[PDB]
Write a protein that binds this ligand. Sequence first.
Ligand SMILES: CCCCCCCCCCCCCCCC(=O)O[C@H](CCCCCCCCCCC)CC(=O)N[C@H]1[C@@H](OP(=O)(O)O)O[C@H](CO[C@@H]2O[C@H](CO)[C@@H](OP(=O)(O)O)[C@H](OC(=O)C[C@@H](CCCCCCCCCCC)OC(=O)CCCCCCCCCCCCC)[C@H]2NC(=O)C[C@@H](CCCCCCCCCCC)OC(=O)CCCCCCCCCCC)[C@@H](O)[C@@H]1OC(=O)C[C@H](O)CCCCCCCCCCC
Ligand SMILES: O=C(O)[C@H]1C[C@@H](O)[C@@H](O)[C@@H]([C@H](O)CO)O1
Lengths: 211, 37, 58, 58, 37, 58, 37, 113, 61, 84, 84, 84
Amino acid sequence: CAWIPAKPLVQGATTAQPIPGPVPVANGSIFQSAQPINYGYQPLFEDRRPRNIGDTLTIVLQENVSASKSSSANASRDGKTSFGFDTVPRYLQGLFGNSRADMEASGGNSFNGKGGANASNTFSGTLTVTVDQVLANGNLHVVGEKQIAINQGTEFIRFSGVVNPRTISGSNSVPSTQVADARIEYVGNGYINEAQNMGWLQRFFLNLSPM
Amino acid sequence: CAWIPAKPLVQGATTAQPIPGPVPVANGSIFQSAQPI
Amino acid sequence: TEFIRFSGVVNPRTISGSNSVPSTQVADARIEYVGNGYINEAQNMGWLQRFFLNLSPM
Amino acid sequence: TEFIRFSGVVNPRTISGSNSVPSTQVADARIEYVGNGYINEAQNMGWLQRFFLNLSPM
Amino acid sequence: CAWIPAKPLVQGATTAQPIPGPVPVANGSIFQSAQPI
Amino acid sequence: TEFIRFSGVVNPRTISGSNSVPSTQVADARIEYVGNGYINEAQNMGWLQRFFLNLSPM
Amino acid sequence: CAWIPAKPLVQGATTAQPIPGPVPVANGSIFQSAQPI
Amino acid sequence: LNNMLSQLGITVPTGTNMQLKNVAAVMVTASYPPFARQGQTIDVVVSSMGNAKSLRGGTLLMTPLKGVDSQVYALAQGNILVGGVQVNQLNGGRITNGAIIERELPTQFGAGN
Amino acid sequence: LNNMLSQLGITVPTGTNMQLKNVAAVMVTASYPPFARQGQTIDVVVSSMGNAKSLRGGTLL
Amino acid sequence: CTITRQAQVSEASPISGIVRLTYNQPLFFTSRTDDYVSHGTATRECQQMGYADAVSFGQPVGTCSIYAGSLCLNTRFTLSWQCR
Amino acid sequence: CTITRQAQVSEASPISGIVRLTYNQPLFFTSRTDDYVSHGTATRECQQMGYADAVSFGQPVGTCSIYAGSLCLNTRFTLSWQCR
Amino acid sequence: CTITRQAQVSEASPISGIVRLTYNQPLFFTSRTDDYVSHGTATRECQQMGYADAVSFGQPVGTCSIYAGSLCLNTRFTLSWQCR
Ligand SMILES: CCCCCCCCCCCCCCCC(=O)O[C@H](CCCCCCCCCCC)CC(=O)N[C@H]1[C@@H](OP(=O)(O)O)O[C@H](CO[C@@H]2O[C@H](CO)[C@@H](OP(=O)(O)O)[C@H](OC(=O)C[C@@H](CCCCCCCCCCC)OC(=O)CCCCCCCCCCCCC)[C@H]2NC(=O)C[C@@H](CCCCCCCCCCC)OC(=O)CCCCCCCCCCC)[C@@H](O)[C@@H]1OC(=O)C[C@H](O)CCCCCCCCCCC
Ligand SMILES: O=C(O)[C@H]1C[C@@H](O)[C@@H](O)[C@@H]([C@H](O)CO)O1
């Protein structure tokens, strides 16, 4: 039913009350600081690649794999021999007078075998991920997740991998093909996802039924 | 069935809380290192 | 789920430009592209058909 | 699974440019391209048909 | 059956943890060797 | 399996350029191109048909 | 049958482990020979 | 140049013009002296590689000098000096003390009789 | 030149212009003297191989 | 259920001085041998080679070694050490 | 199940001074002869040739030698030594 | 099964001073005569010719000599020596 209690994926308050801020200090200056947070050094001319645990990176999946395999074999043998007089000389009647030498035979053997296999997959999304840890060589372990609830179900797109902090180009974007340990999941929920499950009996027949 | 418990291939937390970093050293320099690795 | 796994030995001189090397230049090429789930199960012959294929005359 | 294996003796003077040599320039060329699984099994004659082919007259 | 245990042809771990490397020697040089092979 | 074997005597003056010599320039040319397996077996006459071919009148 | 044991025509190991080579001789030269054949 | 920029932290897109005329690819040659020490410096010779017209007032940037074993034995960086009808060679210059040694070759000196 | 660059650590794509005029392919000939020692040095003669106009102030590498 | 042991050695390459040990985990099982036996074995391997004083330097790596449909019957966990 | 021995010699090439020994492993079997007999045999081969003081210098290599459908009845493991 | 002997001579060419000996191996059989009789025969052939002090210099070569369908009834193994 649609009246069953449910928790939206975007939990918590959707509003933030702004803070008034700190009261000015009567130091004679109109300028007033705002409690600086981060004291870390930041380069000016570098490409702003992710560098720490909390840094975020953009991943363009653009995954495309296609593999094919084919094989065939054949073998055909055909033979057919004949011999007959239909008229035998008087002097040769002893050996071929009757159908004693009359011969006829045929034989065939044909075999044909074939085999094939294909496997293709594509992925054309964009997902922003967050650094999980910094490796010894500087490679970043990135993990990210995105949940979308269009209606009557939810989709989860999750990515994980190791990104070398040198393939990041320009606007903090790196193709998924450049990420090591690529783990990509695109799963769904709800009756829409349930309708794509085989069913217990059909699955059992598929895994056990002969032929 | 689709309700059987399952573990997504992307296991573990999908989030990392950023570290505040190291407190500045009062050496008179605005520049502050970040523990080179 | 689909698993694509690669293994081999690469000479550190055929790597061209953006850290890319064609698979044909990798020695000991081991390439696997396998699948799971009922989609993969549907591509299995089945025990009886496999037995007939391997044993049945002709 | 498909296995492609090569063996031979190569003169270290026919190697041209990018460490490539045509197979026709390799002495003792041993080339194998074999397969496994039911796909490969389906290309086997079968015991009875093979016996008939090797023994049956005509 | 597709549920029979099987070993993928690409056996072993598919990951390598990078080595931190050797600690620098306080010889006054920024350059540090890496154990030539 | 297919076996291609060659044997002969080559004069070390007809070798042109890239260590290549046409087979027509090789003395004692022995060339074999044989096969194995049921594919090769299917190209054998068969004992009875061979006997008839070699003995049967006409 | 396809399950009968068989020996591939390319017998033996398909891999060769590279040799580290000879340790350098402290003769003061960067160049080091490799045992000419 | 793109490799150096990427190492420094700038990743130029692969498809770009990059038509510059203030840089020249060069080969630097040095003479590793006997008993070379780690902190010592040596002179280097810089020679143009491509189609550069001249290297009058150029600067050599952190080139690793390697031996025949492919090992980095020195680091060279500095300013090129070139001569200012017998015209001087403007595609080849010398840097005095431009290279600092990094590795020391083991020697048998002092051993034996 | 491409082989040298690849050995040094730079891999130029196979399809490229590479139209340079500051280098020349040369053959170097030397006279190995009797009783030659490992550390000794000898004089060499460098001769142009292709279509180089001159080797006035060149460097043999 | 949550008991496993016997973490052994699997690789010792003098090139780069790398020692690799491996241990097994059943499907619904955990594994942590003693956190010290692996260090002892790595030190022994380093001493056998020209190096010594093995350092963990890394994190355990787990790759499935046995596949049964959409499951993982066994998992291999690797420990790496850099002899110094 | 996990017992094997008898690692023998298979190649001794003076060119490059390379000695190769081979041993066998059944399908569901392991193999490690003694870790020292191989070194002894390699040293003997080097002494027989003009070299001596064989060094392992490598890692075992395992290539299947017998094929039965989608299986590996026997596996050949090779040990290489560089005489010096 | 694993017993064979009687490695004989098959070629003695003074041009290049090459001596070739051959021995046979059944299908499921091995062969190693004595590792010394071949050297003795090669030395005898070299002495018969103008050379002497035969050296193995090579590795055994095995080429099938009898074919029965997809099998190898007999295998010929050759040993080469360079008289000096
Ligand atoms: C690789 C090469 C290796 C060498 C191979 C050697 C040869 C390999 C062997 C090849 C020859 C096959 C043998 C056949 C007979 C036999 O043994 O195997 C039979 C079973 C088959 C097995 C064969 C598998 C081989 C496996 C394959 C092996 C291949 C290698 C059993 C049997 O015996 N079955 C038998 C039985 O049946 P039943 O079961 O139901 O009861 O009885 C009935 C009734 O008997 C008849 O009754 C008639 C009246 O009614 C009566 O006439 P009438 O005048 O009286 O009226 C009549 O008398 C007569 O012919 C009267 C008279 C006729 C003279 C006319 C002139 C002809 C000259 C013709 C000249 C021939 C020219 C070559 O005779 C003869 O002188 C025959 C000539 C002898 C030539 C000698 C060669 C000199 C070299 C001359 C050399 C020339 C140089 C240029 C009665 N005939 C008989 O008895 C039968 C027999 C009597 C024997 C006594 C005579 C002296 C033999 C003396 C010695 C013979 C020894 C061999 O004669 C034959 O054929 C014998 C043929 C021999 C040829 C060999 C050549 C060697 C080359 C030498 C080469 C090295 C028969 O029908 C039936 O036999 C028949 O059907 C047969 C049919 O006819 C003929 C078909 C031939 C087609 C080719 C085969 C095609 C088959 C192919 C498929 C497999
Ligand atoms: O000469 C013989 O031996 C024959 C000639 C044919 O007639 C044959 O068929 C057989 C018959 O069976 C006798 O009844 O006799």
